[PDB]
Hints:
Blueprint: E1 10-19, H1 23-30, E2 42-49, E3 62-66, E4 79-81
Amino acid sequence: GSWGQCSTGSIQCCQNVVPGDSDLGTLLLDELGIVLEDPTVLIGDGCDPITVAGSSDACSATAVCCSDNNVSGVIAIGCLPVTL
């Protein structure tokens, strides 16, 4: 079993990696009623936790690592972009 290399939090594969203060990200989290302590974090909309494959095909959109655990059901908060 392999999630991904990152001890900064949890690894996931985000369909939308957008800044929380981004036009996109801000619109998204506003739709989700998310209170930001740091709007300058990357929020990953459409983010599924990577716990399958354990290979290059472990992510189809964008590989990230979220430091926060608060998910609205599909998003991710505080994600750092990772690859390989």
